[PDB]
Design a binder for this molecule. Structure first.
Ligand SMILES: *[C@@](O)(CO)[C@H](C[C@@H]1CCNC1=O)NC(=O)[C@H](CC(C)C)NC(=O)c1cc2c(OC)cccc2[nH]1
Ligand SMILES: *[C@@](O)(CO)[C@H](C[C@@H]1CCNC1=O)NC(=O)[C@H](CC(C)C)NC(=O)c1cc2c(OC)cccc2[nH]1
Lengths: 305, 303
């Protein structure tokens, strides 16, 4: 028993982290097969990052201008190309520790493990959830760019995040492994503000299913609702609307408890309108929204990779 | 910026996790050099676990009674010994992934990373704290025994915990790598209660400093308190006493924020007496006590 924020075992990703340096600018890169992926602003000087023209700045660079190191061992760069905001550097060595992997673009509310790295050395791992405003409430210091977020199913690692930016509010923004930013942010040295955030409804519902599984079910009422009616009410409380995919991924938890998805939506709707009334759920008076239905099943069922 | 429950990278430990089976009892083992460490109750049947005379059950076991599997390869046990509640299985093959390691016993209030495993396969990693009553609030299911907790310094893994049991209240208990339990627990199949838990005061203060470093200051106040007057109120709320060593350890966080430790103590006193209302600190509605001063320093230095 017990419910904690659980990250994936990071060994498969640790063996792929390297350091990329251009001049004095250094950050982290991801070494898969014979290609190293990293943020493209590594080619920028400190003054360049204010208003960079990555097309013009990359024209002046050659393969021999890139320092890629696995620890202290240099990997000779034999080719370079740019894809959106990520740099792809071909190296002369195929990473023997390359795991079965895939590049995926996650949705808001989806969670992933972040392997915080500095100078190509992994330092920590923790769970993050993509907020509806396309930010993540992470923990990043100087030199953390290049750090990746990932999910692991069976023996396959699904990379979904590469770190780029810290907003003035202390939250963080990045791209997928194809260089496309999550949200409307750009890789420039400017103060960028994110939209107003909302609560991840599908994850709150998953957290309620988790409580029911553990015998905590006072909040179950005899009401039901339509998906459209619930979505309209939920937005009034700064809650995200549910998609068809959200209803589907809640299927297993619904079948395990015998509580239909729309019935639990009606239960959640009551909690939003009348409040919690001095009671708690799973020991907390706050509704938790950073546990996905998979996170609840994976933790309540001990799945392995 | 930002502050999160952060664990060490588990790669160095993943390369040491194996599966140990004896009869129909299966759990996790830790493979270091040519030795496999696992909880000794693996030699017990379901009926043996009720009242096990481990010295008796062990002498009746043979090397071939232990099935050790490392991935898809079976390791041959060429020797077996017992150190307290930890079984030591000597194998004929040395683990090539064995990192630089040490076995240490953690103190209450200290944190460590847990690599939860099932059937010898790593499943998840998270950070725990050794509660003053020598329990931990983890996430363990059936088959989690054998899972270890650890810290990493440079390239050295310091193993400090191996999981054994879950109390009726939902918290968990285990031993160090020498087989000695943390707390007054025994590896028998009985419902066991822990001592009254207290709050790790030095950790709460460090976490309040992390909140100030990240822009949370609503709980601060202009008042100050003496160390003894703070401890009087703290003990009243089942908080652990704050020593001068704790005050010294919080020094770096005090210098970075410019808030004296005894000033933060006055803030915590007000929080304990008045509560938090509906407000939150670092997204939490409760006072967090599982972050050590060094945990805060590592994440908020230079911010
Ligand atoms: C990477 O390590 C850079 O390689 C670094 C990561 C942040 C540093 C501190 N914590 C982090 O997560 N990223 C940056 O410094 C980026 C560089 C961009 C992508 C070119 N810049 C920011 O994150 C940034 C710039 C500014 C700013 O300007 C002016 C004003 C306010 C906030 C801000 N954040
Ligand atoms: C191991 O996986 C067993 O190898 C298991 C880990 C717990 C299982 C559930 N969640 C866990 O962390 N440990 C146990 O099952 C141990 C067995 C040995 C002999 C210590 N037992 C318990 O944890 C346990 C037994 C009892 C009990 O009896 C009667 C009554 C109430 C609680 C309880 N916990």
């Amino acid at each position: 028993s017990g419910f904690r924020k659980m990250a994936f075992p990071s060994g498969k990703v640790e063996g792929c982290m390297v350091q990329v340096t251009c001049g004095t600018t250094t950050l982290n890169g991801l070494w898969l097969d014979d290609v190293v992926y990293c943020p493209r602003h590594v080619i920028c000087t400190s003054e360049d990052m204010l208003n960079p023209n990555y097309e013009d700045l990359l024209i002046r660079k050659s393969n021999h201008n890139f320092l890629v190191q696995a620890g202290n061992v240099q990997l000779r760069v034999i080719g370079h190309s740019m894809q959106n905001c990520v740099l792809k550097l071909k190296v002369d060595t195929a990473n023997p520790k390359t795991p079965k992997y895939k590049f995926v673009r996650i949705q808001p509310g989806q969670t992933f493990s972040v392997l915080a790295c500095y100078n190509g050395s992994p330092s920590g791992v923790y769970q993050c959830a993509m907020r509806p405003n396309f930010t993540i409430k992470g923990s990043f210091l100087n030199g953390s760019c290049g750090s990746v977020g990932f999910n692991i199913d069976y023996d396959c690692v699904s990379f979904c995040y590469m770190h780029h930016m810290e907003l003035p509010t202390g939250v963080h923004a990045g791209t997928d492994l194809e260089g496309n930013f999550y949200g409307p942010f750009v890789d420039r040295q400017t103060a960028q503000a994110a939209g107003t955030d909302t609560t991840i409804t599908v994850n709150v519902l998953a957290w309620l299913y988790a409580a029911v599984i553990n015998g905590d079910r006072w909040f179950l009422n005899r009401f039901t609702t339509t998906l459209n009616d619930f979505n309209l009410v939920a937005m009034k409380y700064n809650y995200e609307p549910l998609t068809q995919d959200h209803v589907d991924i809640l299927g297993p938890l619904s079948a395990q408890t015998g509580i239909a998805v729309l019935d639990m939506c009606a239960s959640l709707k009551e909690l939003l309108q009348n409040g919690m009334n001095g009671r708690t759920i799973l020991g907390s008076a706050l509704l938790e929204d950073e546990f996905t239905p998979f996170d609840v099943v994976r933790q309540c069922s001990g799945v392995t990779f």
